[PDB]
Enzyme design. Structure first.
Site, short mmCIF file in Angstrom:
data_model
loop_
_atom_site.label_atom_id
_atom_site.label_comp_id
_atom_site.label_asym_id
_atom_site.label_seq_id
_atom_site.Cartn_x
_atom_site.Cartn_y
_atom_site.Cartn_z
N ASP A 1 -11.18 -0.72 -7.74
CA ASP A 1 -11.69 -1.46 -6.58
C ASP A 1 -12.93 -0.73 -6.06
O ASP A 1 -14.06 -1.14 -6.31
CB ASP A 1 -10.62 -1.52 -5.48
CG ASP A 1 -10.96 -2.51 -4.38
OD1 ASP A 1 -12.15 -2.59 -4.01
OD2 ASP A 1 -10.04 -3.19 -3.88
N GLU B 1 -3.64 0.03 -7.78
CA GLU B 1 -5.05 -0.03 -7.46
C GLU B 1 -5.68 1.29 -7.04
O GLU B 1 -5.19 1.97 -6.14
CB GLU B 1 -5.24 -1.05 -6.34
CG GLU B 1 -6.65 -1.30 -5.92
CD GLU B 1 -6.72 -2.10 -4.63
OE1 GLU B 1 -5.80 -2.91 -4.36
OE2 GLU B 1 -7.71 -1.92 -3.89
N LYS C 1 -14.60 -7.85 -4.74
CA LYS C 1 -14.71 -8.11 -3.31
C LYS C 1 -16.20 -8.37 -3.08
O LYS C 1 -16.96 -7.45 -2.84
CB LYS C 1 -14.26 -6.89 -2.50
CG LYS C 1 -12.78 -6.59 -2.63
CD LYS C 1 -12.41 -5.33 -1.84
CE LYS C 1 -10.91 -5.09 -1.84
NZ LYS C 1 -10.55 -3.86 -1.06
N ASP D 1 -1.06 -0.45 -3.96
CA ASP D 1 -2.42 0.00 -3.74
C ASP D 1 -2.43 1.42 -3.19
O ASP D 1 -1.92 1.69 -2.10
CB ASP D 1 -3.10 -0.97 -2.78
CG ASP D 1 -4.51 -0.56 -2.42
OD1 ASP D 1 -5.07 0.34 -3.09
OD2 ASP D 1 -5.05 -1.14 -1.47
N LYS E 1 0.84 -1.20 0.00
CA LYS E 1 0.00 0.00 0.00
C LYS E 1 0.88 1.25 0.00
O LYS E 1 1.77 1.39 0.84
CB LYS E 1 -0.90 0.03 1.24
CG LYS E 1 -1.80 1.25 1.35
CD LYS E 1 -2.22 1.47 2.78
CE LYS E 1 -2.89 2.82 3.01
NZ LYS E 1 -3.06 3.06 4.49
#
Length: 356
Positions: free
Chosen positions: A253, A228, A279, A202, A175
């Site tokens: 996402d 992401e 997800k 991310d 991240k």
């Protein structure tokens, strides 16, 4: 006359004041068999209003006790075989039942929709936590999964990476202030080549439409798999320009959350992302996540599935579903001791592969 819906709130407590995440365990019982599901919320991300989950469950329990489960009984009988029935068809029938039960029919309670879908899938197959049977559930196949790493001191980051590689991972998620991060990424690449280590970063909408382009150029030089959600969601025009000019592939996402029916294709047509990340708990379940996959496939858009902090119950269901797509690229699954009170499970990760 009817059937029984039971539930228990049991928030998952984050491992070390203590903090937790809202979660409910639901069960459907009818004609001597039961099925389990999990309502999982991520405050600040999930659409479901935390303060209303309880009442929604109580309202459903009342409804289910009051009517003869004629349609459900027909579903259980007709799909009892399953050898002669595709999971896409089963999920479609389940959506029909959930619609009749007035569960998140406006898409406002995605986690609840997912929890009840899970319960019906488990009920259909016997209440053995076999939401989707396959070589995976029989332990004859495993799912490739990526590992995690956290931005820190150069030597510790080298240490975590060494750890994961020794553990069998070939793909790691990180991240992502920026200058420090790029230098660290440069540091990583001097010791680990892309062939030896695949890295996905991310951003979680951290970048702005302003600094994004230049930053994507800057990051593309580290040979990363993808970035992401560069910028915050709801900025289609800005994101479409990023996906059109960036030499670094972009995976959406948060952008998918809340979109329904035609809004889904509209978003994909407009942004034309390289990837989308599914997800299930945030999208309303497998039926809807499956539709997203078909939308992506129709447009040549890549994809992978990931967990969203669910307990091992939800994780097992998601892994079983993921296995049906026979993924070749690493998926965002795998055991992650994050809680003090998770559910015992038979899931294990070794060699960068998730299995039972």
């Amino acid at each position: 006359s009817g059937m029984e819906l039971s539930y228990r709130r049991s928030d998952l407590i984050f491992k070390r004041v203590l903090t937790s995440k809202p979660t409910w365990f639901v069960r459907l019982d009818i004609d001597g068999h039961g099925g389990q599901g999990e309502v999982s919320l991520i405050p600040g991300l999930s659409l479901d209003p935390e303060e209303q989950i309880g009442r929604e469950l109580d309202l459903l329990a009342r409804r289910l006790r009051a009517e003869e489960p004629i349609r459900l009984r027909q579903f259980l009988a007709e799909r009892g075989g399953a050898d002669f029935s595709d999971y896409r068809s089963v999920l479609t029938d389940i959506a029909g039942i959930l619609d009749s039960w007035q569960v998140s029919t406006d898409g406002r309670f995605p986690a609840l929709r997912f929890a009840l879908e899970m319960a019906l899938l488990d009920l259909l197959s016997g209440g053995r936590q076999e939401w989707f049977a396959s070589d995976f559930t029989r332990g004859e196949k495993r799912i490739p999964v990526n590992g995690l790493i956290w931005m820190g001191e150069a030597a510790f980051m080298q240490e975590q990476i060494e750890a994961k590689l020794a553990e069998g991972y070939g793909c790691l998620k990180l991240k992502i202030d920026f200058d420090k991060e790029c230098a660290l990424l440069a540091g990583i690449r001097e010791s680990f080549s892309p062939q030896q280590l695949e890295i996905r970063v991310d951003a979680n909408g951290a970048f702005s439409p302003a600094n994004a382009p230049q930053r994507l150029k800057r990051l593309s030089q580290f040979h990363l798999h993808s970035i992401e959600q560069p910028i915050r969601q709801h900025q289609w025009s800005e994101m479409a320009a990023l996906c059109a000019n960036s030499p670094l592939a972009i995976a959406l996402d948060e952008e998918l959350i809340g979109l329904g029916a035609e809004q889904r294709s509209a978003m994909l047509d407009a942004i034309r992302p390289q990837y989308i990340i599914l997800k299930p708990s945030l999208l309303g379940g497998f039926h809807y996540a499956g539709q997203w996959i078909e939308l992506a496939r129709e447009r040549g858009i890549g994809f992978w599935i990931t967990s969203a902090l669910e307990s091992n119950l939800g994780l097992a269901a998601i892994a079983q579903w993921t296995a049906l797509y026979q993924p070749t690229m690493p998926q965002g699954l795998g055991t992650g001791q994050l809680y003090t009170n998770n559910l015992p499970s038979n899931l294990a990760v070794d060699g960068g592969l998730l299995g039972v």
